[PDB]
Amino acid sequence: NFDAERDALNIETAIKTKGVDEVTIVNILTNRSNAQRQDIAFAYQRRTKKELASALKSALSGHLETVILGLLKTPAQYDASELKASMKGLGTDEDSLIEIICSRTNQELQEINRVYKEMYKTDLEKDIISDTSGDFRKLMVALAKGRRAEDGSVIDYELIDQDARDLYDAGVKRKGTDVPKWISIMTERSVPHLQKVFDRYKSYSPYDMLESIRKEVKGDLENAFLNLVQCIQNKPLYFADRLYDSMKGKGTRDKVLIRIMVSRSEVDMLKIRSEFKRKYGKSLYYYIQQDTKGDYQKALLYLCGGDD
Ligand SMILES: [Ca+2]
Ligand SMILES: [Ca+2]
Ligand SMILES: [Ca+2]
Ligand SMILES: [Ca+2]
Ligand SMILES: [Ca+2]
């Protein structure tokens, strides 16, 4: 059914329509997979000899432009560009750097590292170093390598118990904190293993892993650990909470809302929606509908994939 040549022609017609037909552009692009959007971009240049991204940047504006241009990038290109943006200047937007590095898998990070180097002619690790310091830097650099252990064929209960005790003895039990121990265990063990470790951890500490972090460390280091533990425990819930935070109260933190809707639309949006509804009462669709307007709202609601 999909025909990149047909979609490209219709988009060209919309772009050249007096006043620009943003609706048609949104109706098409937010209802095509990332791979299909790539096919559409190639078809567009094949037909017009002009680049689709450039054409749309000129035709669109505001938040809608941000969403559409984001959707046109491959997943790795989008993440790489978002990382670059987070470290721009003094890299004050540590929250975004943390969101991406803490939530991406080994496979995703491998491609991100490759693409980042191709796009910016520099190692992602080097820019991360420039935008981080102390143990926060050590944690972020370790995570960005995307070398977390593979899932084992058999559950290692003795190791699970061992890691749980080490996490306790390294933090809540002693004065100060053995941060390197925390970094090693939380970056090197597989996610399923760590989920069990954090559960077993409750047998040694009166505070769960998250509260232990709030009591042991502070600043960006603390936020990085909190974000990482949430992604390990329940990634869809992690994104649901970030989405809620991006819309709660006056205004909207579009940078976060847009990035999550674009980057997770084809990954785990159904689960994100389920967790969102379960925790906040209203559907993600409802929150988006209430926090945004026009074609921008339309685009985000299509990426949401439906109401709950
Ligand atoms: Ca228009
Ligand atoms: Ca523009
Ligand atoms: Ca301590
Ligand atoms: Ca709001
Ligand atoms: Ca808004």
Element (H, E) at 39: helix 34-48
Contact 141, 184 (CB under 8 A): no
C-alpha 12/C-alpha 211 separation (Å) is 53
Q: Are residues 215 and 227 in the same domain?
A: yes
Among 73, 95, 128, residue at a domain's last position = 73
Q: 31: CA distance to ligand 2 center in Å?
A: 22
Q: Are residues 131 and 190 in the same domain?
A: no
C-alpha 224/C-alpha 99 separation (Å) is 8
Ligand 1 is an ion; residues with CB less than 5 A from it: 19-20
Please state, as a whole number, how many other Cβ atoms lie within 10 Å of the Cβ of residue 85. Answer: 15
Ligand 5 is an ion; residues with CB less than 5 A from it: 252, 291-292
C-alpha 192/C-alpha 187 separation (Å) is 12
C-alpha 31/C-alpha 10 separation (Å) is 14
Contact 219, 199 (CB under 8 A): no
CATH assignment of the domain containing 256: 1.10.220.10
DSSP per residue, 108-177: HHHHHHHHHHHHHSS-HHHHHHHT--HHHHHHHHHHHT--PPPPPSS--HHHHHHHHHHHHHTTTTSSS-
C-alpha 60/C-alpha 69 separation (Å) is 9
Phi-psi group of 240: left, alpha or beta (phi > 0 → left; psi -120 to 50 → alpha; rest → beta): alpha
Q: 26: CA distance to ligand 1 center in Å?
A: 12
Contact 298, 274 (CB under 8 A): no
Q: Are residues 109 and 49 in the same domain?
A: no
Q: Are residues 78 and 59 in the same domain?
A: no
* Data resolution in angstroms: 1.4
Among 35, 58, 73, residue at a domain's last position = 73
Cβ-based burial of 257 (10 A; exposed 0-12, middle 13-18, buried ≥19): buried
Tokens of 177: 């904190």
Tokens of 50: 């002009």
Range of the domain at 58: 1-73
Please state, as a whole number, how many other Cβ atoms lie within 10 Å of the Cβ of residue 127. Answer: 20
Q: Of 197, 82, 187, which Cα lies nearest the Cα of 141?
A: 187
- Round to the nearest angstrom and report the end-to-end CA distance of the chain: 28
Q: Are residues 219 and 252 in the same domain?
A: no
Q: 103: CA distance to ligand 3 center in Å?
A: 26
Tokens of 160: 């699970």
> What is the rounded radius of gyration, in angstroms, for the C-alpha atoms of the chain?
21
Q: 61: CA distance to ligand 2 center in Å?
A: 4
Q: 22: CA distance to ligand 1 center in Å?
A: 6
Q: 36: CA distance to ligand 4 center in Å?
A: 32
Alpha carbons within 13 A on the beta-carbon side of 11: 31
Q: Of 102, 79, 105, which Cα lies nearest the Cα of 238?
A: 102
Tokens of 298: 């339309």
Q: Are residues 227 and 269 in the same domain?
A: no
Tokens of 251: 């205004």
Q: How many domains does the chain have?
A: 4
Q: Are residues 158 and 230 in the same domain?
A: yes
Q: Are residues 293 and 241 in the same domain?
A: yes
Q: Are residues 225 and 280 in the same domain?
A: no
Tokens of 299: 């685009």
Q: 175: CA distance to ligand 3 center in Å?
A: 4
Among 234, 251, 285, residue at a domain's last position = 234
Q: Of 240, 233, 251, which Cα lies nearest the Cα of 281?
A: 240
Contact 205, 172 (CB under 8 A): yes
Q: 67: CA distance to ligand 2 center in Å?
A: 12
